[PDB]
């Protein structure tokens, strides 16, 4: 998933 | 956004305090009423993926909605990666793995890769889902009632019809059978005297007294 | 909309946030009173068809009117194809923005000579809005009469406000339906409205 | 018809 | 309107949402009080005939006033056609003229100010409207027994502004009616000040 | 007459 | 007003809706309080005589003040005429008569000419200087209180008193060296004297908290 | 007498 | 901020009254709700360190949070310094990034240099980092406490859930919480439905499944 | 103000009506609360001495403060004059004259003279110098008008710790230093006080506030 | 002194 | 420390 539940839009992973 | 300067060149511009405020207020006031979606589309005119993410992130509340929105973006980006193999991958369009000048890169290129307009399309699809899920009334429940002016009833009908966003064949079938069928006795008889194929203004003029 | 830059060139610009808000607010405040129409026309100065559709689509409520509007746009577009069957001229749906892209619309409007699909589409919409104003006019002009204690000014205001929404015959009817005491003073003139209003002040 | 009943303005077919 | 850009050339601009509501709100807030005319003129800076028509058409209500205004426009244009047997009266009033015909005439050299000409007509009808709606005569302004001289002078020239004659009548008013209709406490001081006294001196004398 | 009663300012003739 | 554009030449620009409304609201809300004058001067930054007349003319009411103002403009304009007598050489502009600075007998183009000329003939700033002189006279005629009538109340905090003192002193337009201390509370008055002459107003005001 | 009593500012005589 | 002009060169510009006022009002109206963070970041688009301090200094009130913010800026500066020791330009110390020790000219210099040192974006990253701490602390509810009322509409609960989850924020607890906690803390009638759908049910499928 | 235009030349532009109103409202709304100072400084970004004088003169009321403000300007100008004896005499062609104290304050300088100094190469920031005097005086005013002393902020028996810390650092800001982390724990709730002492010294404010949550 | 009591900021003496 | 308690953001030292 590009977006994980509860993390902001455009939030880069890890 | 990316707007055009005086030399004819596309340059990046900061999202304005006006646009930030208008989108916040329109959401605070009209929640996911259908007309919120075209407001978003205009307020995000020229938006980069970052800007769209800003607009969505400026929403306080509606986190069930925002979570469904994330899941649509997921759906659409995973579908993008299935259909596309430096070209942007799905996470780049959604702004998680792209930088601002990378986004500006795709959008100000010739030929442009409109990652902003592509992301926007994803967002509109999820917002459209929220409008239908949050639609308060079903079309089969819109009935005129004894004292309601036909205009106010037609208003309630097409308002409900817009939010439920059903297929065009079903919308036609709704206007063709349910609209006249669920009118109060005073107007239903006047409309039958007009006969088939009457235009909406013909019906509305006919039932103003 | 399409505005012009530093040179003679016409460039596309995003719809303004004030514009977007003023149009939504004008519909909430003045509903379909007649003065909304020129307000729309001014707010849509330089608009492309997409811009017009955005403005229309941002309207929450008034969906009865908005359906009436689609029916009038349909009528005008089929009418366009009946009179218009270098550049590829646009089909009716191209003008209404359903089958034309923004770059296609920008193309027609920035051409020399331009094919003003925005101004043409606006013409259609204005035609539909004027139909709505006539429908929402609560009273017909054949029903506004001067009260006996009512000043002739307040009556004329009520008269031409009603005539405007209903969109010689007015000259006959206005003086004929004045209260009896002003009616003879206006009848004695036999004449500009200014002369009539001072005659009954 | 350019716009079917209940479809938004500018909606592509 | 036709404004000047940053390269020194007159180009057409859209009327702004701000000018439009500025005009709509002045009319809603003020029933053709005298100061509406200078607001209109300022709000219509650089306006084309089309723009002027836009500003007028946005006025909701006051349709008596608007109908009188049209008739003044008729007469002023009808008179233009006699003095002029090229822009005809109907072109300046924007009924038969296009925006591009209008933009052309206004950016011509020598300029043909069809905007300023039409405005000249509109301002003239509006002045007719303020006079018709003027509530009080200058002869009814008399200083109250407990009314401060300032507040009376305020009433006097405010009324004089709406009942606009020619400065002969306005000066005949000032040099007699203002001093004559003051309350007898302050009135005797005005003659003691002497007839040539300035307004400022008169007000200090009755403070 | 350039303008007819109840018709808008700048309304074209005919 | 006459502004500077981007290619550096002084060009005429329409008075904005915002400046117009700003001046009307300042007169409505604050009438002729002393601080409306610098607001006027700032709202008319770069104004042509025509602009100033618009600004004055949009004022509804205050016609006593407005007439007092017209009479001052006369005196200043006649004084200009008596001191600046007034064909024209090709390079030059005709000379501005007193009525021309006030905008009664000059066209907007003549004004723009005088102001955009090199060297500039600042008919707007001269006209403004006249109007502000008339406005200052109005402020002092309408000042309700004399400086000699401000005395510190027994329960009144010393700051509230100094506020009242310099507020009224401002409106009247030195005579305040010892006027402030002499008209202070009996308890604060001796404290100020214990500081001695030459105490700063900060020293005086902290001393009577 | 640039402005006469009761005449608006900037009014041409 | 430093923005691009209409002739293409990076120029310093005054912070606008609209932006200054926007920031004051959002802090006033919304204190430190999670969404104040994106509003700050966007309102400070292109900000110099001077500009960021001006925005922070304009906040009247919330001085406890502002003090926590000072302490986070402090930790980040002490951490910056412990990580960074011709005509080669002077790299910024932590206090330079924060604008205490550096001038506007110095700030512009780092930001418009080739290669740029985005002290504005760096200062912003610290401030955003401190603001996120503040949002976490002012969160009224813990995610574990959130339970669907016996008569509460499912959608209102999911709203409360992800609203609580967003302020809690790093990623570890949240992805598992969505997986386990949402279905687990639903009222007895919606939970047993949600379990019947299985893993891989979408939130959409879950919300129609409990719409009544 | 003096701003940089599309052609990159430092050019004068009028103070905008938005800025004028913004400054008037901030003073009306918030008087001399500490946050008014950075609000002024930002509202006068690029200001000329004239612009500063306009903004100050537009304030209706607060005449005690404005007069203290004048005395600060006086003090600051006299020290400028004593350190900058202008070399009176003919000035050299293509050079500006040297600015006296009253020139920086905008009383004896014309607008064009101010623009000359500010757009000089290198600029003479008379706008920035005046702003420094004015902000100096404004800070003296903020200290005097602060209503509560730091010694009077004690945590209420039912008052949340957060609201008490708010009141503390707010009143701390008005007066303008070592007594901070000491006094804060000392005036907390009898409940919260024993918790903060139990944490031990060296605690961050975040750490204390969670402890009394 | 540059500024005298009761005259405006920027006032020429 | 770059920032001291009760002193404003960006406040210069010494
Ligand atoms: O004074 P007005 O002419 O009636 O305009 C106001 C003004 O907006 P502008 O400064 O952009 O003209 C308000 O702002 P403030 O003076 O309070 O700073 C603004 O409120 P917001 O800043 O919250 O948007 C308000 O808008 P609204 O009616 O949505 O509250 C808007 O009125 P208009 O949009 O009708 O012009
Ligand atoms: O459309 P205008 O009447 O010419 O006013 C514009 C407009 O400001 P407003 O919307 O508050 O009237 C611009 O804002 P946007 O339309 O771009 O959102 C603003 O630009 P900024 O928001 O970047 O400040 C600009 O100001 P400026 O000329 O300093 O760039 C300002 O022009 P005016 O201050 O001359 O009215
Ligand atoms: Cl600057």
């Amino acid at each position: 998933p590009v977006l994980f539940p509860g993390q902001p839009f455009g939030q880069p992973p890890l | 956004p990316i707007v055009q300067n005086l030399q004819g060149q596309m340059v990046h511009q900061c999202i304005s305090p006006r646009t930030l405020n208008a989108w916040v207020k329109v959401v605070e006031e009209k929640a996911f009423s259908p007309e919120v979606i075209p407001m978003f589309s205009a307020l995000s005119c020229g938006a980069t993926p970052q800007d769209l993410n800003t607009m969505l992130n400026t929403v306080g509340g509606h986190q069930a909605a925002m979570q469904m929105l994330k899941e649509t973006i997921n759906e659409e980006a995973a579908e993008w990666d299935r259909l596309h193999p430096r070209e942007p991958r799905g996470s780049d369009i959604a702004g998680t793995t792209s930088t601002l000048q990378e986004q500006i890169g795709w959008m100000t290129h010739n030929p442009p890769i409109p990652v902003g307009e592509i992301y926007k399309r994803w967002i509109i699809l999820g917002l459209n889902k929220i409008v239908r899920m949050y639609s308060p009334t079903s079309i089969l429940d819109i009935r005129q009632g004894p004292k309601e002016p036909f205009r106010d009833y037609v208003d309630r009908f097409y308002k409900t019809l817009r939010a439920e966003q059903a297929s065009q064949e079903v919308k036609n079938a709704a206007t063709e059978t349910l609209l006249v069928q669920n009118a109060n006795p005073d107007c239903k008889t006047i409309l039958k005297a007009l006969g088939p194929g009457a235009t909406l203004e013909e019906m509305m003029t006919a039932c103003q007294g």
Side-chain angles (χ1 to χ4, degrees), chain A residues 2-13:
Chain A
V2 182
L3 290 172
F4 290 63
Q7 283 271 315
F9 295 98
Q11 169 87 60

PDB file of all heavy atoms in Angstrom, chain A residues 2-14, unseen atoms left out:
ATOM      1  N   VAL A   2       0.395   2.245  -0.789  1.00  0.00           N
ATOM      2  CA  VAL A   2       1.018   3.563  -0.864  1.00  0.00           C
ATOM      3  C   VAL A   2       0.747   4.351   0.411  1.00  0.00           C
ATOM      4  O   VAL A   2       1.594   5.122   0.873  1.00  0.00           O
ATOM      5  CB  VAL A   2       0.491   4.298  -2.110  1.00  0.00           C
ATOM      6  CG1 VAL A   2       1.142   5.662  -2.285  1.00  0.00           C
ATOM      7  CG2 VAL A   2       0.703   3.434  -3.321  1.00  0.00           C
ATOM      8  N   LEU A   3      -0.447   4.195   0.983  1.00  0.00           N
ATOM      9  CA  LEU A   3      -0.839   4.879   2.209  1.00  0.00           C
ATOM     10  C   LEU A   3      -1.230   3.879   3.286  1.00  0.00           C
ATOM     11  O   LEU A   3      -2.021   2.966   3.036  1.00  0.00           O
ATOM     12  CB  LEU A   3      -1.989   5.824   1.951  1.00  0.00           C
ATOM     13  CG  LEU A   3      -1.492   6.977   1.120  1.00  0.00           C
ATOM     14  CD1 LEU A   3      -2.693   7.828   0.693  1.00  0.00           C
ATOM     15  CD2 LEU A   3      -0.437   7.743   1.965  1.00  0.00           C
ATOM     16  N   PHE A   4      -0.683   4.043   4.445  1.00  0.00           N
ATOM     17  CA  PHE A   4      -1.099   3.125   5.493  1.00  0.00           C
ATOM     18  C   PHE A   4      -2.133   3.775   6.414  1.00  0.00           C
ATOM     19  O   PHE A   4      -2.146   5.000   6.578  1.00  0.00           O
ATOM     20  CB  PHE A   4       0.116   2.655   6.302  1.00  0.00           C
ATOM     21  CG  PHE A   4       1.053   1.734   5.534  1.00  0.00           C
ATOM     22  CD1 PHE A   4       1.731   2.174   4.397  1.00  0.00           C
ATOM     23  CD2 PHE A   4       1.267   0.425   5.970  1.00  0.00           C
ATOM     24  CE1 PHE A   4       2.592   1.319   3.708  1.00  0.00           C
ATOM     25  CE2 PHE A   4       2.130  -0.430   5.289  1.00  0.00           C
ATOM     26  CZ  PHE A   4       2.790   0.014   4.160  1.00  0.00           C
ATOM     27  N   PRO A   5      -3.004   2.969   7.029  1.00  0.00           N
ATOM     28  CA  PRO A   5      -4.073   3.525   7.874  1.00  0.00           C
ATOM     29  C   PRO A   5      -3.528   4.409   8.981  1.00  0.00           C
ATOM     30  O   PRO A   5      -2.681   3.990   9.773  1.00  0.00           O
ATOM     31  CB  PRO A   5      -4.742   2.277   8.463  1.00  0.00           C
ATOM     32  CG  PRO A   5      -4.446   1.193   7.522  1.00  0.00           C
ATOM     33  CD  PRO A   5      -3.074   1.498   6.962  1.00  0.00           C
ATOM     34  N   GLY A   6      -4.052   5.627   9.057  1.00  0.00           N
ATOM     35  CA  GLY A   6      -3.649   6.511  10.126  1.00  0.00           C
ATOM     36  C   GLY A   6      -2.364   7.264   9.881  1.00  0.00           C
ATOM     37  O   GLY A   6      -1.854   7.904  10.810  1.00  0.00           O
ATOM     38  N   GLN A   7      -1.804   7.192   8.681  1.00  0.00           N
ATOM     39  CA  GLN A   7      -0.638   8.022   8.435  1.00  0.00           C
ATOM     40  C   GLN A   7      -0.958   9.054   7.362  1.00  0.00           C
ATOM     41  O   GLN A   7      -1.806   8.820   6.492  1.00  0.00           O
ATOM     42  CB  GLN A   7       0.582   7.192   8.015  1.00  0.00           C
ATOM     43  CG  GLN A   7       1.293   6.450   9.193  1.00  0.00           C
ATOM     44  CD  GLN A   7       2.379   7.284   9.875  1.00  0.00           C
ATOM     45  OE1 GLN A   7       3.193   7.928   9.198  1.00  0.00           O
ATOM     46  NE2 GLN A   7       2.392   7.280  11.218  1.00  0.00           N
ATOM     47  N   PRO A   8      -0.330  10.221   7.421  1.00  0.00           N
ATOM     48  CA  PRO A   8      -0.796  11.348   6.608  1.00  0.00           C
ATOM     49  C   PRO A   8      -0.627  11.104   5.117  1.00  0.00           C
ATOM     50  O   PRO A   8       0.208  10.312   4.673  1.00  0.00           O
ATOM     51  CB  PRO A   8       0.085  12.509   7.077  1.00  0.00           C
ATOM     52  CG  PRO A   8       0.622  12.067   8.410  1.00  0.00           C
ATOM     53  CD  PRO A   8       0.732  10.605   8.363  1.00  0.00           C
ATOM     54  N   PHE A   9      -1.473  11.789   4.340  1.00  0.00           N
ATOM     55  CA  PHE A   9      -1.329  11.774   2.891  1.00  0.00           C
ATOM     56  C   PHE A   9       0.042  12.318   2.551  1.00  0.00           C
ATOM     57  O   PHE A   9       0.542  13.223   3.224  1.00  0.00           O
ATOM     58  CB  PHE A   9      -2.414  12.612   2.253  1.00  0.00           C
ATOM     59  CG  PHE A   9      -3.802  12.068   2.460  1.00  0.00           C
ATOM     60  CD1 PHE A   9      -4.629  12.574   3.468  1.00  0.00           C
ATOM     61  CD2 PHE A   9      -4.324  11.121   1.582  1.00  0.00           C
ATOM     62  CE1 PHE A   9      -5.925  12.086   3.628  1.00  0.00           C
ATOM     63  CE2 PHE A   9      -5.606  10.642   1.730  1.00  0.00           C
ATOM     64  CZ  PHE A   9      -6.405  11.115   2.749  1.00  0.00           C
ATOM     65  N   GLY A  10       0.683  11.717   1.552  1.00  0.00           N
ATOM     66  CA  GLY A  10       2.035  12.107   1.199  1.00  0.00           C
ATOM     67  C   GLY A  10       3.105  11.741   2.210  1.00  0.00           C
ATOM     68  O   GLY A  10       4.245  12.198   2.077  1.00  0.00           O
ATOM     69  N   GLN A  11       2.794  10.923   3.208  1.00  0.00           N
ATOM     70  CA  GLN A  11       3.793  10.560   4.205  1.00  0.00           C
ATOM     71  C   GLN A  11       4.722   9.520   3.596  1.00  0.00           C
ATOM     72  O   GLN A  11       4.254   8.449   3.194  1.00  0.00           O
ATOM     73  CB  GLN A  11       3.115  10.010   5.457  1.00  0.00           C
ATOM     74  CG  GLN A  11       4.016   9.355   6.475  1.00  0.00           C
ATOM     75  CD  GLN A  11       4.609  10.340   7.455  1.00  0.00           C
ATOM     76  OE1 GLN A  11       3.885  11.031   8.181  1.00  0.00           O
ATOM     77  NE2 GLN A  11       5.946  10.394   7.504  1.00  0.00           N
ATOM     78  N   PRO A  12       6.027   9.788   3.506  1.00  0.00           N
ATOM     79  CA  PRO A  12       6.943   8.792   2.937  1.00  0.00           C
ATOM     80  C   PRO A  12       7.095   7.588   3.851  1.00  0.00           C
ATOM     81  O   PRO A  12       7.044   7.716   5.088  1.00  0.00           O
ATOM     82  CB  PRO A  12       8.266   9.568   2.793  1.00  0.00           C
ATOM     83  CG  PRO A  12       8.153  10.691   3.785  1.00  0.00           C
ATOM     84  CD  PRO A  12       6.697  11.062   3.817  1.00  0.00           C
ATOM     85  N   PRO A  13       7.274   6.392   3.287  1.00  0.00           N
ATOM     86  CA  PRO A  13       7.350   5.182   4.121  1.00  0.00           C
ATOM     87  C   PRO A  13       8.695   5.045   4.820  1.00  0.00           C
ATOM     88  O   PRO A  13       9.743   5.361   4.251  1.00  0.00           O
ATOM     89  CB  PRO A  13       7.140   4.050   3.108  1.00  0.00           C
ATOM     90  CG  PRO A  13       7.652   4.616   1.817  1.00  0.00           C
ATOM     91  CD  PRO A  13       7.318   6.082   1.845  1.00  0.00           C
ATOM     92  N   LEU A  14       8.648   4.561   6.063  1.00  0.00           N
ATOM     93  CA  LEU A  14       9.840   4.267   6.885  1.00  0.00           C
ATOM     94  C   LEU A  14      10.879   5.396   6.908  1.00  0.00           C
ATOM     95  O   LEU A  14      10.743   6.376   7.645  1.00  0.00           O
ATOM     96  CB  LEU A  14      10.510   2.973   6.408  1.00  0.00           C
TER      97      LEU A  14
END
